[PDB]
């Protein structure tokens, strides 16, 4: 898969 | 009720262009009470069979169903029933469903399973292609990434025991559009 980050700040920070 | 008739029209025309999908049962259910909108309290000698231009009372997918039967039984069950009274329970029925309001996208599951795929501003459902049943659904703010290619879409939530979730479809971009703008606001 060529993902596309959703950047959510659960995950990300 | 020139108000009233308004709201009617909207929540009519989304079931009959098919935009809100229902089941059978319920579109049946919605095409009695359009019958006693139309027409007046049921009159079982004239409003019998091959008495409807079925496609100006059922979405598309269930004019070849059969379902007259069950129409005139809806409509017969609204007895004497007023077209405003008859007018605001199809709004309300509508509204009643939980596919009420969702943009839906037709996809397929794995011999494949094909399936509606719905997108709100909080969420992401999986419903019966058929029965148009909520089987399952996602919250967006638990959306962690997504891939779109010109003949599927997957979407991740990061829920490890079940893995991703991968669906068969060409309007991958529409559907990650639809997330990207709702999750602009929510995350």
Redesign the interface.
């Given at each position: 898969?060529?993902?596309?980050?959703?950047?959510?700040?659960?995950?990300k920070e | 009720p020139v108000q009233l008739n308004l709201l009617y029209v909207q929540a009519r025309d989304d079931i009959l262009n098919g935009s809100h999908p229902v089941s059978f049962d319920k579109a049946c259910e919605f095409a009695g009470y359009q019958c006693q909108i139309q027409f007046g309290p049921h009159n079982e000698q004239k409003h019998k069979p091959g008495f409807l231009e079925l496609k100006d009372f059922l979405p598309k997918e269930y004019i070849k169903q059969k379902g007259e039967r069950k129409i005139f039984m809806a409509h017969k069950n609204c007895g004497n029933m007023s077209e405003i009274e008859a007018k605001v329970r199809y709004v309300k029925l509508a509204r009643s469903l939980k596919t009420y309001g969702v943009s839906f996208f037709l996809v397929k599951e794995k011999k494949l399973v094909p399936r509606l795929l719905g997108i709100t501003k909080e969420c992401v459902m999986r419903v019966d292609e058929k029965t148009k049943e909520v089987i399952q659904e996602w919250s967006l703010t638990n959306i962690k990434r997504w891939a779109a290619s010109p003949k599927s879409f997957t979407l991740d939530f990061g829920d490890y025991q079940d893995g991703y979730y991968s669906v068969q479809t060409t309007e991958g971009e529409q559907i990650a559009q639809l997330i990207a703008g709702y999750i602009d606001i929510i995350l």
């Open positions: 898969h060529m993902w596309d980050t959703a950047n959510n700040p659960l995950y | -």
